[PDB]
Write a protein that binds this DNA or RNA. Structure first.
Ligand SMILES: [K+]
Ligand SMILES: [Mg+2]
Ligand SMILES: [Mg+2]
Length: 84
RNA sequence: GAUCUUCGGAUCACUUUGGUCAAAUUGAAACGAUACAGAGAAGAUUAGCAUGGCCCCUGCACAAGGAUGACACUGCGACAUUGAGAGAAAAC
């Protein structure tokens, strides 16, 4: 019964280069190509973050809209906009 | 708000939002490598041009190439049975 709070203060930026020798970015298909397929499942960092309703759920600007949808960033647990 | 008008009002303008889709692991493709075999025509080496399409790739191309691009190239029963004999069975 209290307004929702932002989980992460910062913004997850993108800067990472797999397999430094054998990978090269692809402008059209926005990901790194070349190098060993490496794996189908191996790649799977662990969510650094995690959310729970108890300490995180609350009011937000979208409650007014009847057909509004849930935050893609809340469920994985880094929605940084809070109630806004 | 500007313009007149006479303190009644009139003019002037009048409804956006190009959306492969919300800050990139789990809805834009296609694969590296390692291990196996491993280069068309009836001996051996070898030119090629074709046929077929839910196989494509390079190409501006209705040129031409990719191993002659690759794969494929077969096969069966609208057979009517009687021709006859033998033991059984049922029958001349
Ligand atoms: K040849
Ligand atoms: Mg050819
Ligand atoms: Mg051919």
């Amino acid at each position: 019964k209290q307004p929702a709070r932002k989980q992460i203060e910062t913004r997850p930026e993108y800067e990472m280069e797999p397999e430094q020798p054998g990978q090269v970015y692809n402008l059209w298909y926005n990901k790194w190509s070349g190098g060993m397929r490496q794996d189908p499942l191996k790649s799977q960092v662990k969510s650094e973050t995690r959310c729970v309703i108890s300490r995180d759920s609350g009011y937000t600007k979208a409650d007014k809209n009847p057909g509004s949808f849930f935050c893609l960033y809340f469920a994985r647990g880094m929605c940084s906009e809070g109630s806004k």
